[PDB]
């Protein structure tokens, strides 16, 4: 998985958080842990919880 698709809405509450709407394909930059990933989506780069997404390609 190098791109992943958001299934759920992640509302960012801290700087560095990548906010997510369902259907957003996020380039996966690194799996930082089981629970937190780093990616970019629509020009933005930040971190989001891994359970918000599923594999895309």
Look up the CATH number of the domain holding residue 21.
2.30.30.40
How far apart CA 44 and CA 26 sit, in angstroms, is 10
Technique used by the depositors: X-ray
How far apart CA 39 and CA 3 sit, in angstroms, is 9
Q: Compute CA 15 distance to the chain's CA centroid, rounded to the nearest angstrom.
A: 14
Q: What's phi and psi for 50, nearest 5 deg?
A: -60, -35
Q: How many domains does the chain have?
A: 1
Quote the domain boundaries for residue 22: 1-57
How far apart CA 57 and CA 44 sit, in angstroms, is 19
What's the reported resolution, in angstroms, to a tenth? 2.2
């Amino acid at each position: 998985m190098e791109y992943v698709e958001a299934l759920y809405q992640f509302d960012p509450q801290q700087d560095g958080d990548l906010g997510l709407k369902p259907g957003d394909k996020v380039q996966l930059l690194e799996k930082l842990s089981p629970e937190w990933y780093k990616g970019s989506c629509n020009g933005r780069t930040g971190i989001f919880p891994a359970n918000y997404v599923k594999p895309a390609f």
